[PDB]
Amino acid sequence: IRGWIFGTTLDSKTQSLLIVNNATNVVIKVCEFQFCNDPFLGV
């Protein structure tokens, strides 16, 4: 689990809560500029 997305449209077109975890750190954004909408990272 890299994290979560929450919202109504869930696609940054409407306001879209993005949550990500890296090491013990947590990084959060709500923005409309498109995310890593493809979730991929190579394990």
Partner: protein, 70 residues
């Protein structure tokens, strides 16, 4: 809360305001003191410039979700 904008919008912006987006994106704690420093820039941010488009509860996209100047 700083920008280049219409000399009309200088007289406006504060939290919890009338309509949808000016409440929703600005849903802040009650206390405020709405004041503004501004000066005309039609010779600096214009010649010739039209880049002045700006954007259920909290359904904000990208008062209203779309308006523009130039």
């Amino acid at each position: 809360d700083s920008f280049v904008i219409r000399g009309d919008e200088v007289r406006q912006i504060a939290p919890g305001q009338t309509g949808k987006i000016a409440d929703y994106n600005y849903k802040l704690p009650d206390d405020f003191t709405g004041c503004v420093i501004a000066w005309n820039s039609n010779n600096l941010d214009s010649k010739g410039n039209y880049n002045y488009l700006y954007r259920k509860p909290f359904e904000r996209d990208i008062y209203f979700p779309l308006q523009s100047y130039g």
